[PDB]
Design a protein around this nucleic acid. Structure first.
Ligand SMILES: Cc1cn([C@H]2CC[C@@H](COP(=O)(O)OP(=O)(O)OP(=O)(O)O)O2)c(=O)[nH]c1=O
Ligand SMILES: [Mg+2]
Lengths: 398, 944, 401
DNA sequence: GAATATTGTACGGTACCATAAA
DNA sequence: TTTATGGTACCGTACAATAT
């Protein structure tokens, strides 16, 4: 479930998800076959990606972004195939279609086939030499990327997921230490924004070859679904991708040259967004201030329409210039009771609701309501921007 | 038939029109006069030329009062101006109670009794008042204080924004935010007097409605300019003399337009106080709150001074201007009304937005040159640069008073805290250095001046103070004139240096630049003037032919021209007072009209017009009278196109065709032999046609080879006195295909025929008449008989300032023409019940706001008004007939906007698409007299 | 072409582009077949996308983001196609391969495939009803999205993907041309804002096959003009086709009337815009400096060290680095470089990397607290106290914006 | 001997105020 | 305590740009 059904209904109604209830099942959401995300979901994903980038890329002096193509054009691939429809139409233009010509066309289509990427590891490993030259051969260093990966789905359907990947190049001796450090850092990052950090857990696992690895789960109401995995892949993939001389693969740590180990950290941002939505859920979605899509809601009371609209427009422009998301609720021609507006904004994870009346024109006091406390508080309109920005900054710091 | 001709084969009016206007019978011209006119025309070889007879116009004019045109106009003017003259007499001859001991502090009007008691009142109930308002410039255009005078008692009004305090007030003006100085419907109509009375009028609640005025304003500035006015040069000399070529006797009978100076000149006594605080200009609302009594006392003092000046000036103005038409026209010229809509707000934003985008683009080009020029400092390389070797390159010293391993959770925290603490330690060493920070030490001195201060709230990174007018901009761009670098001289302006120490404006040896001579850039005003900036409109042709080269050359000059007008006018265009009428105040006709927009904004602008702000008694308005109509390469040039009539209304108006030319021609004809076309100039002026395209302006433009506006400038300069070098300079400026020799030859050929040795010349009679009128003891207008200002009479000025006095006759005749037009149009509107209103008058251009149904009737009334004015001019000069070619308007424009032509779409950089695309404004119509007669059957009645 | 070669060499060397010179031709960059972008190129693209989002989505009260999938599942389609290799192998198992069977297989493959998106218009139009309900049926309103679109490339065959920013505007039919002109002016102003030479950005008028009005925005590359943004007045044909049947759900309320809105499509290419800005940055004062706009420069501040106590200099640099990171300013960690190079080489390297300011910390900073500050545009040193450096940098960026 | 009127912007000089120096 | 010195507000002058 009842809670899951209510949460999905609220998300669809409040423009978090999209589509009808038929395609909004748990399996469709988890497999990446959902029709899409609403604007609030897009904003939440952008906030989560910004937080991940700040906590992984910005604050690290040896982590750099990497750009990887969605398709990998490669012939003679060992072991879905992208085929241009223009070539098919051109072939269908010729009505002969002999046996030999069609067999040759099928062979050419097969081995020239551009695979859709299933992970960002290959593209990051493709930039090993150039990015190593960027850091002037000073191990350790890493490459981070946020993008969309394609996964086949059985039942045929296509499932795409947004993943944030960090590929860490480390000397062999400190590989386990760096793996533990990254595990702790990622677990702390996931627990930071959660109201119930205990639902985020970690586990130890080993691959088929025996390589050490770790997995991070989230405790959904129906069970635990993996959200991030770490692997100690060694140097097998790097050596395979660069056959021949190993001098170019040498990394300098201290005063010695060695082929670095490969550490892969892959996390799913869509499932993380879903987990945070479940954590947030009186029907109020108590999202973290650093992740809430819309923070401030502006409304009007009763009185001179023109002056109230002008004051609301000025405050809206000031808040936009100060980098605060505001819901333009003062343009609503229809009038609704304050209880309904408060319920709607609580369902939309609105941090504060601000209404402007004739008293604001008289002295300059506006009614401020907090989502967590549900208590009104008169405040002067001059320092509202400072209060909001310091609220967000202090919430981020703690 | 209806066709008639003069003894000089010039077509005259129709039989019916002449019979109704000039009557029947008169003194026929003498045969000797006809022979003299024929001889004069034959001497110049301008006789016997056939003329196609213009079609006759037959219409029944409305009944004419009196027995003559003079009597008719005098009766109309007396009927118009009787109640206002009565109110003026009541105000002049009345008692005046002393100022109340203490001013009341309450919202709204209050009446001060004889004992000083204050009783609240809704509106004043007095016919005549002297008015003065107070405006706090730091709060907006809303009025703040106002005190009124009256024969019965004083009156005071306090703005609601001054008594009650609120966090925020309405930024959009409303009728409820102004002063209620009208009585809703024994006596009728009101007179309000004041110094610069348009400013007080603009803050009146009932003056922004579309219905009507029913109130006339009399300005002491206009009467002062009429009586004892001064010209710009005269005012400059007066100010210089007061602070510290002969005949200075005019100093004691003249003063500047300031109220204190006027009071000293006319009334005298103790000088008026000034309150050096200047709270209203520079102050806050609380300052007015604390200093209320002093401000009220100063306003009362200003009102008292204005009242004394008015009661001292009215008899003098009546004596010097006895014609009631002058007073009626002055009263009617102060009710200007400019309707605007919501598109006015969008125009200001688009014009400002386009200005900012273009200004930023030009600045970036100069910033990059400035930024790159700083690299020449190293190695003393600026010495060898031919453009940047004479700047401030000094610098100011800064004054002063392994392996690896992941980190532990606790160890990582400690490292950040230790690093943070160490950085904060250096932050504590701020107790050094000068307290006021230096402005970019170590940078070159010239670059230092181009950067705004760090503490300036308008700070912008880089040299953001650069502009084309700055003296460093040409040096940065390495501008070269004919392959020579540009150099600036204090005593000679901009020039260029010729290496080798070439024919040009020079050389000047006062500039000691080793190894190079100094020449001077040519200027449009001659070799006696200095070029203040090569980035001028004159040098744009000099860049197309490669004479002027940069190192975005043409782009810099082109973009300067686009924003030249908006740079000098954006402050007063954007600060116009606009009052938006509410739904209730709008007429019921507009609401029901389909074009009415519920979500739109309808408002009006009342121009601040001084009716007589010129020695020639011309109206002056800082913004509208000097506003561009529309141009394809000027930002904000569509200012007049935004005066849009409300739905159900349209603007009907026309422009006088060759006003000065016809006035001078008819003066010369009346002085010569008393017949039209006697003078060669008059004969040429009469036969000029605008629809055909062969008029004096057009003929001069075709002969010289310039545009029609340039022809107007050339003709008006020649008439008012301009030398042959001036003519050749004008020709070269307006035509780049003629050299100096050819231009001089053309100017000499043009000037040989005119003027002459005045007798024997083409235009000798008009010059002689103007000199005779100007040099008379008391010069008066030939039509309305209005005396010149006492500061320009021959007794007080002798044989000085002759050109201004000569021009005064023609310009005051044009002003009298405008007065006659206004009074006749008002009479026609009142007689036949035409739902119209005077919109705005621009010298010779008159516009009216009429409903959608009475447009053609208003056009016919305007044509009749023009005919009557021309006939009255002819009768006043002594000629009892009027030529047909100068009888009616060339065209009458019916349009929803103010524009020179009803067809132009007004494409500007700010408005590239056009008026029709932007605001759904269709093109107008330009009807002629025949079309109006066909449409309205030649009658002004509503039933017909 | 010498300038283009030098610019490409600098971009590849300074980690703007990637790959060898063979695949760094103009055609490969324009067609989307380039191997990728370096970290500086990624940062520049992120800055450009942030500027576009702020100037298009943030400041507009009726524009909302929209999420569109890269692949469109196809339940039959008219006319790249994703074909499973397992089905191809199964078909090749049967060696008969008759004409009719192969034709039927080709028809089935064409009917059933997940097409890769070539534009974001279809996905935005797919969210018409829900986003219209979001604005409570108050026209006009729009949907904006930044994403990657796939384009076939001819020359056996290659795949070209481009990053495009698309805005789909729903407007009443009467104001369609007015809104088109307004959006054209706004986009042209936005493109000219960050350019040192705004004249290179131009606009043109064009009409479609059906006669629908449209506009195109070009950039003047050294070799010619390449389109960077297009605007179209598509009417309501696509919207009606996508929603056959009842038109009540498609009605939009403007004023007090209900009408089917017109579709305005604004599509711009962020990759070609980044390339155009890079060309704009790179123009006897020979100097290889990429003068990028402060709001688009990837890295803004460079930190270096002089001579003296290594530990204290490193600690001060670390503290300043942390403060600048907390204040949202990108800093190049140049003080960790063990190798020592002359200041001229570091200045040249930072100029080639579009570094706004270079800061070096010496023993004088430990003594009093004065650090050497050098400006990219002016190339003039200026001593400044370390306390107000953050305020100076943030106010510089804000005032430039 | 062009004539009326309106306005802005850049540049240099003057004098008061707050600071720092002796 | 007494004495240079830069910053800043104000004003006069020259040149240029609008309208009829
Ligand atoms: C331009 C200019 C004009 N004047 C005065 C003198 C007359 C009035 C009005 O005539 P106008 O300019 O409208 O032109 P106008 O002759 O009336 O042309 P139209 O008949 O209106 O076409 O302007 C002047 O003294 N010096 C000048 O340089
Ligand atoms: Mg005229």
């Amino acid at each position: 479930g009842e809670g899951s059904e209510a949460l999905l209904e609220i998300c669809q109604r409040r423009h978090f998800l999209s589509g009808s209830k038929q395609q909004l099942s748990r399996d469709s959401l988890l497999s990446g076959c959902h029709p899409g995300f609403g604007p609030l979901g897009v904003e939440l994903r952008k906030n989560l990606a910004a937080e991940w980038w700040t906590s992984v890329v910005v604050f690290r002096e040896q982590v750099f972004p990497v750009d990887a193509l969605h398709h990998k054009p490669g012939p003679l691939l060992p072991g879905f195939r992208l085929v241009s429809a223009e070539t098919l139409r051109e072939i269908l233009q010729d009505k002969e279609l002999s046996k030999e010509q069609l067999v040759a066309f099928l062979e050419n289509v097969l081995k020239t086939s551009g695979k859709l990427r299933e992970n960002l590891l290959h593209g990051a490993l493709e930039h090993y030499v150039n990015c190593l030259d960027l850091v002037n051969k000073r191990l350790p260093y890493g490459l981070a990327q946020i993008g969309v990966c394609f996964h086949p789905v059985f039942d045929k359907s296509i499932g795409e997921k947004t993943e944030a990947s960090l590929v860490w190049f480390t000397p062999p001796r400190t590989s386990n230490q760096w793996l533990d450090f990254w595990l702790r850092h990622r677990l702390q990052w996931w627990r930071k924004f959660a109201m119930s950090p205990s639902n985020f857990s970690s586990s130890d696992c080993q691959d088929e070859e025996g390589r050490k690895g770790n997995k991070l789960y989230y405790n959904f109401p129906w069970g635990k679904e993996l959200i991030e995995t770490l692997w100690n892949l060694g140097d097998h993939e790097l050596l395979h991708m660069y056959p021949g001389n190993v001098s170019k693969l040498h990394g300098r740590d201290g005063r010695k040259n060695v082929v670095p180990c490969v550490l892969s950290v892959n996390g799913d941002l869509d499932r993380g967004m879903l987990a945070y939505l479940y954590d947030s859920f009186r029907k109020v979605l108590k999202l973290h201030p650093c992740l809430a899509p819309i923070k401030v809601a502006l409304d009007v009371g009763r009185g001179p329409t023109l002056e109230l609209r002008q004051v609301c427009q000025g405050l809206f422009n000031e808040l936009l210039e100060n980098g605060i998301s505001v819901w333009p609720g003062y343009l609503e021609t229809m009038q609704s009771s304050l209880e309904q507006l408060y319920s709607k904004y609580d369902e939309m994870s609105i941090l504060f609701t601000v209404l402007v009346t004739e008293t604001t024109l008289e002295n300059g006091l506006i009614h401020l309501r907090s989502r967590d406390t549900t208590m009104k508080e008169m405040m002067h309109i001059s320092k509202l921007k400072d209060f909001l920005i310091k609220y967000i900054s202090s919430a981020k710091n703690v | 038939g209806q066709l008639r001709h003069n003894p000089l084969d010039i077509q005259m009016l129709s039989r019916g029109l002449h019979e109704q206007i000039f009557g029947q019978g008169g003194e026929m011209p003498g045969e000797a006069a006809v022979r003299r006119s024929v001889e004069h025309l034959q001497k110049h070889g301008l006789w016997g030329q056939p003329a196609v007879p213009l079609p006759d116009v037959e219409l029944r004019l409305p009944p004419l009062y009196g027995d003559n045109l003079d009597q008719h106009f005098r009766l109309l003017a007396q009927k118009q101006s009787l109640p206002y003259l009565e109110a003026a007499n009541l105000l002049l001859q009345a008692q005046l109670p002393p100022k109340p001991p203490a001013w009341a502090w309450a919202e709204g009007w209050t009446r001060y009794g004889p004992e000083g008691e204050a009783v609240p009142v809704a509106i004043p109930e007095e016919r005549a008042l002297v008015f003065a308002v107070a405006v706090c410039l730091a709060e907006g255009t809303c009025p703040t204080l106002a005190v009124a005078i009256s024969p019965s008692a004083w009156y005071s009004w306090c703005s609601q924004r001054l008594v009650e305090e609120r966090y925020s007030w309405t930024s959009q003006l409303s009728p409820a935010d102004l002063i209620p100085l009208e009585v809703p419907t024994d006596w009728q109509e009101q007179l309000v007097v004041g110094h610069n009375v348009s400013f007080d009028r603009a803050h009146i609640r009932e003056q922004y409605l579309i219905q009507g005025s029913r109130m006339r304003f009399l300005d002491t500035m206009s009467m002062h300019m009429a009586i004892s006015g001064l010209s710009s040069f005269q005012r400059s000399l007066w100010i210089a003399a007061k602070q510290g070529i002969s005949s200075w006797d005019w100093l004691d009978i003249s003063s500047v337009n300031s109220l204190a100076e006027v009071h000293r000149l006319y009334v005298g006594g103790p000088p008026l106080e000034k309150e050096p605080r200047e709270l209203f200009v520079k102050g806050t609302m609380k300052d007015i709150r604390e200093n209320f009594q002093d401000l009220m006392q100063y306003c009362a003092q200003d009102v008292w001074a204005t009242h004394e000046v008015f009661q001292q000036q009215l008899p003098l103005f009546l004596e010097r201007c006895p014609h009631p038409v002058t007073l009626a026209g002055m009263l009617e010229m102060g009710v200007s009304y400019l309707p605007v809509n919501q598109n006015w707000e969008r125009y200001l934003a688009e014009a400002q937005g386009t200005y900012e985008e273009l200004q930023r683009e030009m600045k970036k080009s100069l910033m990059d040159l400035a930024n790159d020029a700083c690299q020449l400092l190293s190695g003393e390389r600026y010495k060898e640069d031919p453009w940047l070797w004479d700047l401030e390159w000094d610098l100011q010293e800064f004054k002063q008073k392994e392996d690896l391993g992941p980190c532990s959770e606790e160890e990582e925290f400690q490292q950040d805290v230790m690093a943070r603490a160490c950085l904060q330690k250096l932050k504590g060493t701020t107790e050094l250095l000068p307290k006021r920070p230096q402005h970019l030490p170590g940078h070159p001195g010239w670059y230092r001046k181009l950067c705004p201060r760090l503490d300036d709230p308008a700070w912008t990174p880089g040299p953001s103070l650069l502009s084309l007018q700055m003296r460093v901009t040409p040096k940065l761009m390495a501008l070269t004139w004919d392959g020579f670098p540009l150099h600036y001289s204090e005593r000679h302006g901009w020039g260029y240096l010729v290496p080798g120490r070439h024919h040009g404006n020079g050389p000047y040896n006062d500039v000691d630049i080793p190894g190079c001579w100094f020449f001077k850039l040519p200027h449009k005003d001659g070799n006696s003037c200095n070029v203040g900036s090569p980035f001028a409109k004159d040098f744009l042709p000099k860049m197309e032919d490669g004479t002027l080269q940069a190192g975005s050359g043409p782009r810099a000059l082109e973009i300067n021209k686009m924003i030249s007008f908006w740079r000098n006018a954006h402050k007063r265009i954007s600060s116009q007072m606009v009052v938006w009428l509410p739904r209730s105040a709008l007429p019921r006709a507009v609401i029901r009209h389909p074009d009415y927009d519920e979500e739109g904004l309808y408002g009006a602008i009342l121009p601040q017009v001084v009716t007589a702000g010129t020695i020639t008694r011309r109206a002056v308005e800082p913004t509208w009278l000097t506003a561009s109509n529309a141009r394809p390469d000027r930002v904000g040039s569509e200012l007049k196109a935004m005066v849009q009539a409300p739905p159900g209304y349209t603007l009907v108006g026309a422009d006088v065709d060759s006003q000065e030319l016809w006035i001078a021609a008819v003066l010369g004809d009346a002085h010569f032999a008393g017949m039209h076309g006697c003078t060669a100039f008059g004969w040429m002026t009469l036969q000029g046609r605008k629809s055909r395209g062969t008029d004096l302006h057009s003929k001069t433009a075709t002969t010289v080879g310039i545009s029609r506006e340039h022809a107007k400038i050339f003709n008006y300069g020649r008439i008012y006195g301009a030398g042959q070098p001036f003519a050749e300079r004008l020709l070269m400026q307006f035509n780049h295909r003629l050299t100096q020799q050819e231009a001089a030859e053309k100017a000499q050929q043009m000037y040989a025929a005119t003027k002459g040795l005045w007798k024997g010349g083409t235009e000798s009679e008009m010059f002689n008449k103007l000199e005779s009128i100007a040099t008379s003891d008391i010069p008066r207008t030939p039509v309305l008989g209005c005396c010149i200002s006492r500061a320009l009479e021959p007794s007080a000025v002798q044989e000085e300032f002759m050109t201004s006095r000569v021009n005064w006759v023609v310009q005051s005749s044009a002003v009298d023409y405008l007065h006659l037009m206004l009074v006749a149009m008002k009479w026609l509107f009142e007689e036949f019940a035409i739902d119209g209103r005077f919109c705005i008058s621009i010298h010779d251009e008159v516009r009216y706001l009429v409903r959608e149904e009475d447009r053609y009737r208003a056009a016919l009334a305007l044509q009749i008004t023009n005919l009557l004015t021309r006939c009255m001019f002819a009768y006043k000069l002594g000629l009892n007939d009027l030529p047909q070619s100068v009888a009616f308007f060339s065209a009458v424009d019916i349009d929803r906007c103010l524009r020179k032509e009803v067809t132009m779409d007004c494409k500007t950089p700010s408005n590239p698409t056009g008026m029709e695309r932007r605001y759904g404004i269709p093109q107008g119509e330009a009807l002629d007299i025949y079309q109006i007669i066909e449409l309205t059957k030649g009658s002004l009645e509503k039933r017909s």
